[model samples]
Target: SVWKTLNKWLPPLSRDKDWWWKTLGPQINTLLTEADYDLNERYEALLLLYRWVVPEMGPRPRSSVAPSKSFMTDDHSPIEYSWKWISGNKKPEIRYAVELVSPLAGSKQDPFNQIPTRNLVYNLAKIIPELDLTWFEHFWHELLGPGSPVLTKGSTVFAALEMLHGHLSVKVYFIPVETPDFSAWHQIKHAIEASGCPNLEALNHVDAYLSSHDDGRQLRPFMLAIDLVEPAASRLKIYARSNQTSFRFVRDVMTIGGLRTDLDRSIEKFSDLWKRALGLDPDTPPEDELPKVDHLTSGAVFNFDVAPKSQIPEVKAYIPVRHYANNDLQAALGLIGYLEDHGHGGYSQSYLRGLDMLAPSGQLDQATGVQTYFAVACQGEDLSLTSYLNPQFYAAFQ
Candidate 1:
């Protein structure tokens, strides 16, 4: 009875009472019957149902003949579909993340990963070395044990990612989401491709790419690198001085690597390395730095309006600072803590929390004023440390 109830989520099966004779059911079952059906095809098929078809059906009634968990909920929520389908896969949340940025392009004529210039081969080269390789090893050990095929696959992906770092630049942007509409999210996706960056339709496809690699024996790291770009590439935009932006708080968690046992110390070490690599001393300001603006380094640019919540409502303009004040840390943490505990989507939650416990904050406050920013401490750039710490550098923001 339960099986029959669940079948309601799929196209109706044949009238025959025989369960084994059922056809055109869930994509999972369809793949189970095809002797030639491989894991990748199965994954792609399931994703179609997960992302496109199920959403069209809207939510099933609670008292319907369908099983209690037949994909859709009352609001036709993608949240429920995500929970059952994408999250149903191995390391569901993590896997979904990989799929989000993974190289796979769905339903399009050309597979997104097949685009040679934009492949993981380019991006992984920029990311792998900065991360502690041991995390991957340990991650696999925990997931698949020491010597399993899955464990080997995970290790192999890391190795490939390590090799690609110097050979290519796979830059990633930390785009923030604010509007509640899923359709609005597409703008970021379209922007990336139009800007000649990678095309990431969603996370599940990224997961499919990872699992589909080299006959499922080689794990793909492209999606992971998408989220782990060099700290220097990070940025933050603050639109309102009064709204008390949540963006900065989460940025702090990412920069500090929050409370993750597997990553915090190393992330801290990485931060020190970032500063050291740049030849910076937070305590000392260098003298006689050129004021010429031919090429500026470090700090962030701010431009936006102030919302009603602002301490100063009438003021709306750009404030170019040399860098975030060294004292801006305390503002973001309290709010970041609230989001991680109550936010939707475990897939992202676990990933953000893993970065060590940062979560998305109130991006919608833009109505009060648009604030685009990383946590103040988390944003900056310049080829070297001396460049950013220059007295002129400090004065430029002043």
Candidate 2:
């Protein structure tokens, strides 16, 4: 399997300018080979990463993580690297996803996705102009304009993108500046209806979020995610966040809308996930030490798919490791150790690629590097792990 031999064929890890190339080379090579991408296409993608994407992230490190002053143009890193793994009998295949940050300018009279803006999406369109973005225009007013359901205008990284398995899967996501209350949440549902999104008002299987009600629980919507396969949305997910740090809070918010999954089962599955993934006991408070689960332990942002009422959709937990686990690479290493102790190993290497291949040209060896985040998706008691790396090239990375 290439996963087994990738280490020997790839160059050694280093802090030199070539560090990033050495890091990303294997993942790019392995994926191109698995997708059976044309030789030149693979070459083009590699060069694209080197010439275009890498520079957008940052050409060099500015300082250690600190307090962010203001949202200037390109203050935060412009990219996030994510992975999808294969745990089957086939080759140790791990699908690669490179999410480039979308530009936020040019939406005064028009929508952000209507005309190509000044950043990644615009430049990317130059090479693949056929990229369909009308999907965004459909709900631009109700979702992104002034008085839109979400406070979408002032976000520094207003949009996030990924090239799905196809030529350019417009899997775009928007992070709201403010969490939504029940009234605001209803407005979002209205907007989703206005856009004619699938499974609207009457079909909503979940309960609307309440900032103050519902047992005094404080669950709110943080991100609006849509997977576009055409001019229409193929999948829609609402990610929720809360101030509570217990699995009960996580499970309650997840199943509050009456997901087909039962309440008892929520506790059961969440408990198992807490122990297996975060390496924490459901009842214990985190101590000041390694294996710190503060961010995830404090509870993570959970994604809920807007699917058919009869369908039991998938739920994914996004744990902000960089928010508490020190640095990205260091946190990733900590994850490997945490998982290994839980009797799960062999997936460490897949999580180590991105930062090395794309850090600032002159970034130091021991400096804060990629801000890695951990994600987990559960299937009938089986937990699948994924890693998302933030380059931490943002202004005032602290």
Best by TM-score: 2
Which TM-score value belongs to model 1? Answer: 0.18
What's the distance in Å from true for residue 87, model 1?
33
* CA shift of 192, model 1, Å: 12
Model 2: how far residue 383 lies from native, Å = 2.0
lDDT of 1 by residue, 375-394 (tens): 21211221010000011111
Q: Global CA lDDT of candidate 1, please?
A: 0.24
- In candidate 2, what are the lDDT values of residues 272-318, reduced to their tens digit? 54543444444554322233244322435677676544345556666
Worst 10 residues of 1 by lDDT: 382-391
Each candidate's lDDT (Cα)? 0.24, 0.47
Please state the error at residue 141 of candidate 2 in Å.
Answer: 3.3
What local lDDT score does residue 138 receive in model 2, on the 0 to 100 scale? 52
The alpha-carbon deviation from the true structure for residue 35 of candidate 1, after best TM-score superposition, in angstroms, is 46
Best by lDDT: 2
TM-score of each: 0.18, 0.64
